[PDB]
Amino acid sequence: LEKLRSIVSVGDPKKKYTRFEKIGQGASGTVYTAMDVATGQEVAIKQMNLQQQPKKELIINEILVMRENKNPNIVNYLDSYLVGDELWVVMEYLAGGSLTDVVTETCMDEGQIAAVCRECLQALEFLHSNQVIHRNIKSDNILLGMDGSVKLTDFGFCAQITPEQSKRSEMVGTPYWMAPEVVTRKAYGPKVDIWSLGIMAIEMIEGEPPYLNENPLRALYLIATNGTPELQNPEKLSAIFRDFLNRCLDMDVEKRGSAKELLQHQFLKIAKPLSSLTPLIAAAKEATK
Ligand SMILES: Cc1ccc(CO)cc1N(C)c1ccnc(Nc2cc(N3CCOCC3)cc(S(C)(=O)=O)c2)n1
């Protein structure tokens, strides 16, 4: 809390931003829409409430890692404020919503799946080069722009590796997206996010990650004992797509591809413009309406 107090900005956020309009809830807190009074840029603010914050060290890590690792494929952090018992986190606004709404309500073609994977891999190649392991890659941590921009968010679970203390060993993430080495409690590397991306590609195909009908503990045991998840209907996908997924979901960490390596895959060469994701966004919004 003392370290937290010395990260936040000076000044009234209520007097710096106006046109506040609630666009969601509510795990970590309320999400509002706003407009910068001086610039006119449209911003997205999350009101946290520190009483519902369990670890707290997480909130500082999220803020610090977002700050130090700015890239076109990472939701652009603006500023933070502590009004009174509440923590306000100001970011660029991505009105397109989350990938979750797209994967759960729409059927994505191979060219669109490829486009998202490419952008997601660009975010990962950036973080892994800066020795940052995201650890919670899943459709829910992908925000879309109205133009079709793909941006990575939620850095609360991330780990900073060093040539001295790398790999990592703590069972962190969301069960259904976790790599077998994470679940089994082995020392793991950045390639855990690659596995999480393969699961997110399965979401894009099937609408949900393997074992979602199960309870998280069962899923942990199913990822541990079964490994590489089998698809409902593999025959529906192309060979180059079937290959991209095998490289993402390989049990052998050394065999599993890096973001640098997967960015060169034949699959991403069939990727469509990001404007091809705008009819998906339009359908998701109509479906969840
Ligand atoms: C304010 C914020 C701060 C820090 C971080 C880092 O964790 C993320 C954000 N968020 C969640 C952002 C950032 C930029 N843009 C958006 N856009 C957006 C979010 C939502 N949700 C709110 C409820 O929970 C799920 C996400 C809904 C819609 S929509 C469908 O109404 O157009 C748009 N949200």
UniProtKB/Swiss-Prot annotation:
What reaction gets catalysed by this protein? L-seryl-[protein] + ATP = O-phospho-L-seryl-[protein] + ADP + H(+); L-threonyl-[protein] + ATP = O-phospho-L-threonyl-[protein] + ADP + H(+)
Which cofactors, by name? Mg(2+)
| Parent-protein residues present | 254 to 542 of 545
What this protein is called in its record is Serine/threonine-protein kinase PAK 1
Top-level division of the source organism's lineage:
Eukaryota
Annotated function: Protein kinase involved in intracellular signaling pathways downstream of integrins and receptor-type kinases that plays an important role in cytoskeleton dynamics, in cell adhesion, migration, proliferation, apoptosis, mitosis, and in vesicle-mediated transport processes. Can directly phosphorylate BAD and protects cells against apoptosis. Activated by interaction with CDC42 and RAC1. Functions as a GTPase effector that links the Rho-related GTPases CDC42 and RAC1 to the JNK MAP kinase pathway. Phosphorylates and activates MAP2K1, and thereby mediates activation of downstream MAP kinases.
Report the leader peptide range: none
Which family does the record assign? Belongs to the protein kinase superfamily. STE Ser/Thr protein kinase family. STE20 subfamily.
Processing and modification events after translation: Autophosphorylated in trans, meaning that in a dimer, one kinase molecule phosphorylates the other one. Phosphorylated by JAK2 in response to PRL; this increases PAK1 kinase activity.
- Sorted UniProt keywords: Acetylation, Allosteric enzyme, Apoptosis, ATP-binding, Cell junction, Cell membrane, Cell projection, Chromosome, Cytoplasm, Cytoskeleton, Disease variant, Epilepsy, Exocytosis, Intellectual disability, Kinase, Membrane, Nucleotide-binding, Nucleus, Phosphoprotein, Serine/threonine-protein kinase, Transferase
Protein's UniProt keywords contain DNA repair: no
Assembly = Homodimer; homodimerization results in autoinhibition. Active as monomer. Interacts with GIT1. Component of cytoplasmic complexes, which also contains PXN, ARHGEF7 and GIT1. Interacts with NISCH. Interacts with DVL1; mediates the formation of a DVL1, MUSK and PAK1 ternary complex involved in AChR clustering. Binds to the caspase-cleaved p110 isoform of CDC2L1 and CDC2L2, p110C, but not the full-length proteins. Interacts with ARHGEF7. Interacts tightly with GTP-bound but not GDP-bound CDC42/P21 and RAC1. Interacts with SCRIB. Interacts with PDPK1. Interacts (via kinase domain) with RAF1.
**Protein kinase domain spans which residues?**
17-268
Class in the EC hierarchy, top level = transferase
List the expressing tissues: Overexpressed in gastric cancer cells and tissues (at protein level).
Recorded disease is:
Intellectual developmental disorder with macrocephaly, seizures, and speech delay: An autosomal dominant neurodevelopmental disorder characterized by impaired intellectual development, poor speech, postnatal macrocephaly, and seizures.
Activity regulation annotation text: Activated by binding small G proteins.
Which terms does the UniProt entry file under GO BP?
actin cytoskeleton organization; apoptotic process; branching morphogenesis of an epithelial tube; cell migration; cellular response to insulin stimulus; cellular response to starvation; cerebellum development; chromatin remodeling
Q: Where is the active site?
A: 136 (proton acceptor)
Residues bearing PTM Phosphothreonine: 170
Predominant location: cytoplasm
Taken from the UniProt entry, a GO cellular component term is: focal adhesion
Enzyme Commission number: 2.7.11.1
- Record the organism: Homo sapiens (Human)
The record lists ATP as bound by 23-31, 46, 92-94
What lineage does the source organism belong to? Eukaryota, Metazoa, Chordata, Craniata, Vertebrata
**Which sequence positions carry the modification called Phosphotyrosine?**
32
GO MF annotation terms: ATP binding; collagen binding; gamma-tubulin binding; identical protein binding; protein kinase activity; protein kinase binding; protein serine kinase activity; protein serine/threonine kinase activity
